[PDB]
Amino acid sequence: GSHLEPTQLGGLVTDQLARLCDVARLDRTDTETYVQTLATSLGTAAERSLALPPTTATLLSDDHTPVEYSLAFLPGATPALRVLVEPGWDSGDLAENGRAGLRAIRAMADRWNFSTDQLDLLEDLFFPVAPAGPFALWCALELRPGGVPGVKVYLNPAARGRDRRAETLREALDRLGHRQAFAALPPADDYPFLALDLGEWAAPRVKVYCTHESLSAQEAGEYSGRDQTTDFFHAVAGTPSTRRALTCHSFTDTVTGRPSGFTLHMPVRSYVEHDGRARDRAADVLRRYGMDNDALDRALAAVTPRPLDDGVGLVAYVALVHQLGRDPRVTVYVSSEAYAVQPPR
Ligand SMILES: N[C@@H](Cc1c[nH]c2ccccc12)C(=O)O
Ligand SMILES: CC(C)=CCSP(=O)(O)OP(=O)(O)O
């Protein structure tokens, strides 16, 4: 059973996650495992009444829920389910938020027997005494069949102040042995996140994110499958020749200085009037790639029964993922809306 009730934040998000586990065709026991894992990772946030304000006005989601879901679609396959969480959200300030986040990661490392050495190497860069925003630590769990998840950690290059974003990023890459990786990154307006794959992965990466305030379709294809990426840009943007977007650049070896993965993240919630339009664009991309567009509709209804045209931001992002030696993947990011539905434009 669950100690959580539907009036508590943890009750709403574990109910959402359980329904999503069924879309992802996870069995009863893996579902129970991951539902409990989500509640544990939230700490005291799980038990917080939804009637109270969000403890932290977090960047993780627009309404400041410390949870976001995502579905990774491969051609011909049922989608893989992942969840992003902020373990330290129910903390009083950013320093304590980070401490609780690292504590949660250490607990996961103990339970699933993986090392935190690589993350440990970076602690002074990303967890200084008086940290700057906008966040301290997020964790993403890939909810794999079998109950042992894939673990990723997200860190803030601006932790030591905005003026040291590139200094921090570059020092982190050097410490990890990726001394040529920075040179492979495109021009950018921000370096909002650095992510690390923890534990078991066929090729664990460091992932560097770049914000582009005014990206064109041509630039997106250049930074990437040029044609695939430009087509995806137009499809999600509804194209108006530049849009806000993020690129992610994945490095899985320290030898060449070349990335092994590229992702274009399009914030479709910023481009459309309501989630009816965003679902339409996501469904069309999935369908055209031979992916499981029916499962997208089932996932949206698993999260919320509201009509899609009654708000915007349920479909937060649609992303096109290229990884050398794998088929393209499309990821749809889906909001919890535990605190607010953003009204349609
Ligand atoms: N909500 C934040 C962080 C975030 C959550 N999910 C994401 C998916 C892609 C890019 C960023 C994010 C943002 O829009 O930046
Ligand atoms: C959740 C955030 C901050 C960014 C989304 S990129 P991701 O971690 O979901 O990328 P992968 O699915 O791990 O390739």
Write the layout of secondary structure elements.
Blueprint lengths: L8 H15 L4 H15 L24 E7 L6 E6 L8 H19 L4 H4 L2 H4 L10 E6 L7 E6 L9 H11 L18 E5 L7 E11 H7 L2 H12 L4 E10 L9 E6 L8 H14 L4 H11 L11 E9 L5 E7 L10
Antiparallel strand pairs: 1-2, 1-10, 2-3, 3-4, 4-5, 5-6, 6-7, 7-8, 8-9, 9-10
The site of tryptophan has 9 residues, from strand 9.
Describe this structure in words.
The protein is α+β, with helices and mostly antiparallel strands. The protein has one domain. Helix content is 32%, strand content 21%. The protein has a ten-stranded antiparallel β-barrel with strand order 1-2-3-4-5-6-7-8-9-10, surrounded by seven helices. α7 (217-223) packs antiparallel against α8 (226-237) and α9 (275-288) runs antiparallel to α10 (293-303). The longest helix has 19 residues, at 94-112. Dimethylallyl S-thiolodiphosphate binds next to β1 and β4. The PDB classes it as transferase.
What are the main properties of this structure?
transferase, binds dimethylallyl S-thiolodiphosphate, globular, alpha+beta, 10 strands, transferase activity, transferring alkyl or aryl (other than methyl) groups, ABBA_NscD-like, ten-stranded antiparallel β-barrel, ABBA, 6-dimethylallyltryptophan synthase, binds tryptophan, 345 residues, 10 helices
